[PDB]
Amino acid sequence: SLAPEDGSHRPAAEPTPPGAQPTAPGSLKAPDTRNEKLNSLEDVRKGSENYALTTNQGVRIADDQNSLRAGSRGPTLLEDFILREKITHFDHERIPERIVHARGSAAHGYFQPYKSLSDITKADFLSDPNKITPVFVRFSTVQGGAGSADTVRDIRGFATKFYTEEGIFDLVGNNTPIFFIQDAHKFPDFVHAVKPEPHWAIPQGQSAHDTFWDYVSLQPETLHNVMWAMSDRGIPRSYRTMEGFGCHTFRLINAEGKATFVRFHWKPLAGKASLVWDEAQKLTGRDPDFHRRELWEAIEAGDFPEYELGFQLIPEEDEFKFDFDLLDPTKLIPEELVPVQRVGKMVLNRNPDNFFAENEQAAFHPGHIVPGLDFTNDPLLQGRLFSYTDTQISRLGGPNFHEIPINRPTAPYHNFQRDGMHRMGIDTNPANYEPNSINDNWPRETPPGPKRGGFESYQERVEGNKVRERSPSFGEYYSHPRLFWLSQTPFEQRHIVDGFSFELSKVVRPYIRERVVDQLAHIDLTLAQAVAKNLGIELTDDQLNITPPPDVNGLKKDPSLSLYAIPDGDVKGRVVAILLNDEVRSADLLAILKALKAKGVHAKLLYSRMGEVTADDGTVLPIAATFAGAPSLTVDAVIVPAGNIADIADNGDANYYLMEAYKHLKPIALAGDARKFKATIKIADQGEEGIVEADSADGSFMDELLTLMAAHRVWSRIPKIDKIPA
Amino acid sequence: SLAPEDGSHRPAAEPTPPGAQPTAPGSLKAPDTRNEKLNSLEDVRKGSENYALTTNQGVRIADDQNSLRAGSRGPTLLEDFILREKITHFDHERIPERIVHARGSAAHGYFQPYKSLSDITKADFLSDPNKITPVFVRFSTVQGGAGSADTVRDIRGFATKFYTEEGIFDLVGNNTPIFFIQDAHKFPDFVHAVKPEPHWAIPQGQSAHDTFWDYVSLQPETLHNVMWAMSDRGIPRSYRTMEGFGCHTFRLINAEGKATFVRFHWKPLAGKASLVWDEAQKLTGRDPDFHRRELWEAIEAGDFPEYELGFQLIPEEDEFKFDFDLLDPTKLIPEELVPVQRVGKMVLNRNPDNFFAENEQAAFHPGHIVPGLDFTNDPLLQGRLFSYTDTQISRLGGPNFHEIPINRPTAPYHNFQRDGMHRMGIDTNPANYEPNSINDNWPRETPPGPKRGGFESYQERVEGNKVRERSPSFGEYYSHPRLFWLSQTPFEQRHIVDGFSFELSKVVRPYIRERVVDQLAHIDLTLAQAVAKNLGIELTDDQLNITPPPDVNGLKKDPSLSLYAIPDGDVKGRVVAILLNDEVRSADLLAILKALKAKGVHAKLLYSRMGEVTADDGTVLPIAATFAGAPSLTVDAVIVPAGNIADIADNGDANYYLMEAYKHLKPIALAGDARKFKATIKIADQGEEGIVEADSADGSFMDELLTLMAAHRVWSRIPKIDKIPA
Amino acid sequence: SLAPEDGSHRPAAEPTPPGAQPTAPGSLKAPDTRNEKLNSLEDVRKGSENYALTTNQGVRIADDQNSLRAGSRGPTLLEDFILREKITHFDHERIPERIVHARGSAAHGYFQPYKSLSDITKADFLSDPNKITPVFVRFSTVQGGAGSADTVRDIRGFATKFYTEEGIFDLVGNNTPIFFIQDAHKFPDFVHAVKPEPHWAIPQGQSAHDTFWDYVSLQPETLHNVMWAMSDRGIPRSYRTMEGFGCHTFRLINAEGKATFVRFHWKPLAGKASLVWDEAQKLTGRDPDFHRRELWEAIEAGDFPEYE
Amino acid sequence: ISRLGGPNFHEIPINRPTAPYHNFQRDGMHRMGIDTNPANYEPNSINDNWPRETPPGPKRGGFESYQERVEGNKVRERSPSFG
Numbered sequence A, B: 001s002l003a004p005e006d007g008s009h010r011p012a013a014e015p016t017p018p019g020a021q022p023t024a025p026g027s028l029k030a031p032d033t034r035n036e037k038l039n040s041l042e043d044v045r046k047g048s049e050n051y052a053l054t055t056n057q058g059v060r061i062a063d064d065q066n067s068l069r070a071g072s073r074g075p076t077l078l079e080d081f082i083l084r085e086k087i088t089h090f091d092h093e094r095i096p097e098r099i100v101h102a103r104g105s106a107a108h109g110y111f112q113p114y115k116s117l118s119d120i121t122k123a124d125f126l127s128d129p130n131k132i133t134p135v136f137v138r139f140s141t142v143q144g145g146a147g148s149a150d151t152v153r154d155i156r157g158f159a160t161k162f163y164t165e166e167g168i169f170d171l172v173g174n175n176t177p178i179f180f181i182q183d184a185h186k187f188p189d190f191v192h193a194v195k196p197e198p199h200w201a202i203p204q205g206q207s208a209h210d211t212f213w214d215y216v217s218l219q220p221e222t223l224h225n226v227m228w229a230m231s232d233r234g235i236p237r238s239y240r241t242m243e244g245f246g247c248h249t250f251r252l253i254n255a256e257g258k259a260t261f262v263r264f265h266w267k268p269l270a271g272k273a274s275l276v277w278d279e280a281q282k283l284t285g286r287d288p289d290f291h292r293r294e295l296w297e298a299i300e301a302g303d304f305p306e307y308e309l310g311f312q313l314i315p316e317e318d319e320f321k322f323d324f325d326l327l328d329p330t331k332l333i334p335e336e337l338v339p340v341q342r343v344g345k346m347v348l349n350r351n352p353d354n355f356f357a358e359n360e361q362a363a364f365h366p367g368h369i370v371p372g373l374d375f376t377n378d379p380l381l382q383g384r385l386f387s388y389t390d391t392q393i394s395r396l397g398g399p400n401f402h403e404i405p406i407n408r409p410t411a412p413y414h415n416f417q418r419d420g421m422h423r424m425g426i427d428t429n430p431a432n433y434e435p436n437s438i439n440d441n442w443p444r445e446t447p448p449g450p451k452r453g454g455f456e457s458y459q460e461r462v463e464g465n466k467v468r469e470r471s472p473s474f475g476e477y478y479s480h481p482r483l484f485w486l487s488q489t490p491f492e493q494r495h496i497v498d499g500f501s502f503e504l505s506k507v508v509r510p511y512i513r514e515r516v517v518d519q520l521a522h523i524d525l526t527l528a529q530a531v532a533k534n535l536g537i538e539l540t541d542d543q544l545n546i547t548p549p550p551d552v553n554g555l556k557k558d559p560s561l562s563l564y565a566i567p568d569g570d571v572k573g574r575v576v577a578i579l580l581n582d583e584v585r586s587a588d589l590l591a592i593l594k595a596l597k598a599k600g601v602h603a604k605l606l607y608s609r610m611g612e613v614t615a616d617d618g619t620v621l622p623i624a625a626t627f628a629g630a631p632s633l634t635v636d637a638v639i640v641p642a643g644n645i646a647d648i649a650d651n652g653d654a655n656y657y658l659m660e661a662y663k664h665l666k667p668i669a670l671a672g673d674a675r676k677f678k679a680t681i682k683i684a685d686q687g688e689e690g691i692v693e694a695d696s697a698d699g700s701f702m703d704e705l706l707t708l709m710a711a712h713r714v715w716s717r718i719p720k721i722d723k724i725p726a
Numbered sequence C: 001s002l003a004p005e006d007g008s009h010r011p012a013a014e015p016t017p018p019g020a021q022p023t024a025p026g027s028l029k030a031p032d033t034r035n036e037k038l039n040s041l042e043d044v045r046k047g048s049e050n051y052a053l054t055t056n057q058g059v060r061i062a063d064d065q066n067s068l069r070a071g072s073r074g075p076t077l078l079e080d081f082i083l084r085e086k087i088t089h090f091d092h093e094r095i096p097e098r099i100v101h102a103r104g105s106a107a108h109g110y111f112q113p114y115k116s117l118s119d120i121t122k123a124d125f126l127s128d129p130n131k132i133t134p135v136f137v138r139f140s141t142v143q144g145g146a147g148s149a150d151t152v153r154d155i156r157g158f159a160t161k162f163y164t165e166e167g168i169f170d171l172v173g174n175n176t177p178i179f180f181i182q183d184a185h186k187f188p189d190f191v192h193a194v195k196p197e198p199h200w201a202i203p204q205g206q207s208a209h210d211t212f213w214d215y216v217s218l219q220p221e222t223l224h225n226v227m228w229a230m231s232d233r234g235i236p237r238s239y240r241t242m243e244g245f246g247c248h249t250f251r252l253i254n255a256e257g258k259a260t261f262v263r264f265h266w267k268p269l270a271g272k273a274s275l276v277w278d279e280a281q282k283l284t285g286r287d288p289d290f291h292r293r294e295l296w297e298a299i300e301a302g303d304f305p306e307y308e
Numbered sequence D: 001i002s003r004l005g006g007p008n009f010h011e012i013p014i015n016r017p018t019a020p021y022h023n024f025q026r027d028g029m030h031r032m033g034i035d036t037n038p039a040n041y042e043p044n045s046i047n048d049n050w051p052r053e054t055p056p057g058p059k060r061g062g063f064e065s066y067q068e069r070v071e072g073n074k075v076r077e078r079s080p081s082f083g
């Protein structure tokens, strides 16, 4: 017995806030959270308590501390089969990482539609509001390895595996509504350009290098998703606070055989929020696991990630009614033109048990559709259909990857396929071919029908010659970048300029920077000039006269493209740093902690050391982390209670905590004599918007703080930080 | 519905004789035959009847006859995910075959001890006659690939996986008591020498080529197993009629920790029986699946293969009591010196459902032992311990091969190993290391003990320097070949001479043949002379004067080494061909079948076409096969009843059937006018021992036939067969 | 020295008739034969005479007869890297065999066109009667595994890899002009039917079983190729004496962009010849390697397989 | 075996010895070397036993292990001197 007698090694099996208890496997943290998929995995879940340690062959091990040797200082013997099994398994633990989206964090949950969608699709999962579909979702970055950092500037993946009664449906989306390239044939060129360069394998998790910008400069189709990546969209606060999109026009197919074009949306019910660049970059160093950690802890805390599934629906007859081609994956469909219709709600409510087994081996692929859905001729989507099945053969070791437990359908599956590496299912069918008489032709084909029918493709008319040719309709590259730019707030536009400027400054060959600047001048002159100024580049008279691209169907902005133009803030699940001193005013802390609790906002009590401090009234205050150990990067706001301020007033880390949080536009609240820290961040006596201050933490001090937090960051402070040395 | 109206597509789920029903997966043929392992495989068995045809993702297929194309004569579309999944699975069906023993046939069964062996071993499966242990046994040849022929001349493997309550114990044996080589380091040399030669990959399933005999002539340690292989041991009639041996001295360890040396044996309860060379070779062409079919059909019929497990036990103080080394795996322990103690019975009573999933993916390894057993320093066994774990990494795709259903222990298995390709187990343990506090150190080590204890190696004393050196005590190569030779009957000796003669005639380089004959002269002059005569070689004066090797501890023979010296026949499960005519004397056939049934001997009714014939009393007789379709090679004896003989009397195939059976020493019975056939095999009017003849098939006629069948073959006929052109 | 004094261990490096000499690797048998592809493989050919025996890491081995143990009757030691490297390579020698056509026999050769075909195709290997194209050809059965018998009744494969100056062109044909099925979606159904049945994995190298004929009886499209398989075409005498076919209509495309439909043929210059069934079936027993042996020994004799 | 896909990892260019290497090992996935040796085993007469073992000695000799003395029982036990 090595566990502590007080049982403090084991986390409570109840929802607890971030940092209160060690984290655990989902079935141990939340044993009563169930769904049909989680239940169906019970056959392979393996426990441990009270069991004897064995080899894989079930042989009990007596000494797991020593190899077998001739004499206690002698050579190890080949007949040590316990040593060799154990080391063999270790020696083969690793499998190939995903070619792209290798870095990803995942969770189980469930989806339910708001109402039946039978008028527009025969998809069984969308047929009845009382139909619950288990999901498994993996969020990811794109470029970096499985051991790269979470808060890089990159697109994010948002993949949802729906375990439906009529088969697996994978909705394999991203956090922007378009992609960099038009045709799947170029995907290796694009990916190679953004990935670490091949001579030296640098840089990790970054597009800020020559080959990416070289490619972008020579392939203007990429400019739209580049605008998105350079904006604060490229640096989300949390997977809970970004949008999701299905990237392509697909089809819905109803029982009557009518096709409707659809683009898929996920709206984050926690709101849209992003970091700022300096914060995101520094955070890759201070906690490269920050998003994986935040997702896991939100789920353990009961702050379940929730998203609303939405559809943009376009009738068959309206295929050609836009300025852009619906099948072009570099074009978005503005919500002002085609609204998103609410469809249903997904809640992620349980972490996995074993990350490797459930997360690393999960296979998602957009060809996994079900009756009631179908594809289109989008030439990016068309190639994806090839890639996601082929790649599993090396990644997951062969064609039986659907038998890896997380991948298994909960719907029945029976067919005539046999064998392959790792074959688990033992087929008893006397036949392995059809048609057969020896088993009366079972399992049998099923006609298409309104429910429970076989899959049949929509009979779309095809007419043309066999060509390798880009549609002329796809040859417009600047209008959507422009629409995106004009839709952003002035502070968002500033962060876009700064992303381009920062990234191009890492491009070693100056001609590439110049070429990119030329492309910016084809989108918007103010943008092009601002980036040019940061790069010491002067636009030519010609570049000054490039006429801007047309409006998109008469639109000059669409506010749904902004993260922040329309408020959607939610504070629940956010976190506040509380900077302790050695004699805190206990009435300030009561008021602070209860107000945060009442709104679902977490707190972490920080100090210059671990252990405890004692408040004015003798209350013993447990310390979560030190100032340097849990930097302001990791919180949404900072509160300093009154008390013995002289304890920390000269602590460099405590001052720096506030400068860093100030620079990154976070709300800061100072009570009583904590107002002496005003001088550290240079705040005028009469105060400033975004700094909450009062004699004490009572009255409106906490409501004012929470109002700031609902608006995420203090954008008005941007001109003030510009000269802060932090 | 494609099945016939009369339901004759489905085999009866009751025991039926060979050829009476189509064969079937074991769980459909014998659904109520159970054991703990067969039951535990229920979670992975998949049926088929009344299920819809789907993709692997659970999506119902409407049309499994066509690819999706643009028009019905148009190009196939990349978006056809149904086609690609189905073709992808097909394209990756195959896994590497085993490096050796790739050709093999397997069945489920059980083992039970005759009494408790706790005085000599604490192995839990041997602790009580009530302890029933599920087994899965795979029989094999050695050289040929998985698609090679069964009735080759080769050593056979006999591998038994014991699913004990204290772990998997694999007893991985062969059908002779020794091996060709002494030290594992030479295994690839020997195996490369026997296998098809590397320039052109010829010959398949044969040792009868230059490189094998080149290696043998240069490595006299091989000569002992070579003698076995060249005897009729190399061509068993049936996996049911051959012996098994564990090849090495292992140890038993009892609760007091006392070690006893042991060699393992399996004694076939159906007795020992082999083919003759001409018959075996021809059989590789008429039915290369003969042994696999014969095993499957024996089990379907209720002729369950039964073997008695036997131990040769040698106290530790008797290590040096013999004039050979106990650790030298080219040496056998004569039963005259150390008798075999009969320990328990294994019965094989159920075929697999899916050959690939259960047989091809099964992994046996002699290092899979349990507490109560242990190894010795046998330097061939020592290197085996390395290879059987290492080879599964490519063959079965990674280190989780124990999770493949057939391989899973039925005993509990828990440890801290994680990940690896196609990981099925989802571990919930917070800890993946020990010692740990976070899971109170579970799963925990277990001290060795009398029952349910951890594995601890027997503390054998090791004293010597680190050397690559063969023990001087291994340096004797001819005494055991000689003892084996002298123990054979005169007809077994002739067949050995013929095996060496035939093989060496296929060796193109004549000096190799000469060098092998030189080695034979070191074993026995009469043998060496007989083979030399067949090769047109004359022994030199030196070779005629080589002193024979010494007896083995005073033994000049041991009849346990002979297949046939001690009567051991069992006719149950054997098969007789009955050559029909278009008007059979029904009273002969009634008697014939009645008597065969009372002894559990099967019959096949043969004619010159399929369909039926009609006997003299109007009995309709269904025909199993033509004369050419089911050759005498596939039966143990031939009966020709009376009736219209003129019908078949000039049938070439009918006459040849008897010539072929006669040549191969099989019992032939002729009734009434069937004695007209004595003419074709040149039998004197007064008769011949081994030919049963009478006016009719009365009671004594069948008794004499069944007596001959108990003695397997008519060895006295050998001098008569030289003159027969067959 | 282990070789005999009279050098009779070494096959004569000159054409010799079947059975006259032991067979040998090609580059030792016929070192004067060459073509562009054979020359290009020289960088990976490894000899052997006069070299020391080494690990794969280039370390010379002193004793390749024993494992390293603690005393000459003691246990084998984990530090024996020479033993583990040699046994690890052996343990992993096998790769998956081909799903179909797993049994086959191959040789190097060359191809030359009789005249330029530039009026009907711009394919460079057909543009000049002086242009010689190295080939590597594999002949095969279809159903059985890599260790199954040659003279089974089955379709035969006839695959030619042309190493052209404008890329590899593979002409992947069979010895009949058609196939059993119409649409590739059914290929795993037909292949599963003809292959060994899934419960017991019987029969090897034979369509003579229930599932094959069940499929045929339910899919009359198969009858045409079934007729060919049931004829003596299904049991050829030699890969040298069978026809080859490209199976499908392909297209030739000339320099002007004109498309012409094309079906490909190989005509055996040694003529057409097949066994009879009783002989072919017994021969699978007496010599399951007869066609592989026959091909190899024909080339060693200078009876080179020729095809138009 | 998993990381580099088989036992021919020494043939991956970076891994290849510059010193000669010849032996009787054959096949494995993505086998690069084409062996011409009539023999793939030793001892052989058909290639006069090449490539051959080499005795140990001062330079260019075969590898032989130092003959360290081993005395002890087969134990899974940590040396007391390590404690």
Ligand code: HDE
Pocket: A098, A099, A100, A101, A104, A138, A139, A140, A156, A157, A158, A159, A172, A173, A174, A179, A183, A184, A185, A187, A245, A246, A247, A248, A329, A362, A363, A364, A380, A381, A383, A384, A387, A388, A389, A391, A392
């Ligand atoms: C719409 C969102 C989106 C788009 C447009 C693309 N990816 Fe993704 N991707 C793979 C290939 C692939 C291709 C061929 C294309 C355009 C032709 C895209 N991508 C663009 C992949 C290599 O097959 C992939 C890697 C491993 C795998 O299983 O499939 C793959 C990953 C991926 C993910 C991660 C899913 C997960 O396992 O967590 C996501 C969210 C996307 N892609 C989105 C996506």
Ligand code: HDE
Pocket: B098, B099, B100, B101, B104, B138, B139, B140, B156, B157, B158, B159, B172, B173, B174, B179, B183, B184, B185, B187, B245, B246, B247, B248, B329, B362, B363, B364, B380, B381, B383, B384, B387, B388, B389, B391, B392, C091
């Ligand atoms: C005595 C019974 C016996 C002996 C002495 C040996 N074999 Fe076997 N063999 C493998 C390697 C190996 C070595 C290294 C040695 C002596 C050093 C022996 N053999 C001699 C193997 C390559 O590891 C093997 C191939 C596939 C596999 O999983 O292990 C292997 C197979 C094998 C079988 C087949 C078991 C089965 O899969 O059905 C049998 C019965 C033997 N060996 C017997 C055996």
Ligand code: HDE
Pocket: B091, C098, C099, C100, C101, C104, C138, C139, C140, C157, C158, C159, C172, C173, C174, C179, C183, C184, C185, C187, C246, C247, C248
């Ligand atoms: C026309 C000659 C012919 C035809 C019509 C087909 N095969 Fe072959 N085959 C493979 C798959 C395949 C499919 C999907 C179809 C129709 C849908 C055919 N076959 C019909 C394969 C599984 O991809 C295959 C196995 C290994 C491989 O590399 O490809 C394959 C083999 C094969 C060969 C063997 C070439 C060789 O290595 O000697 C030949 C001659 C054919 N097929 C001919 C063929």
Ligand SMILES: [S]
Pocket: A177, A178, A179, A246, A247, A248, A329
């Ligand atoms: S996309």
Ligand SMILES: [S]
Pocket: B177, B178, B179, B246, B247, B248, B329
């Ligand atoms: S053995």
Ligand SMILES: [S]
Pocket: C177, C178, C179, C246, C247, C248
């Ligand atoms: S074909």
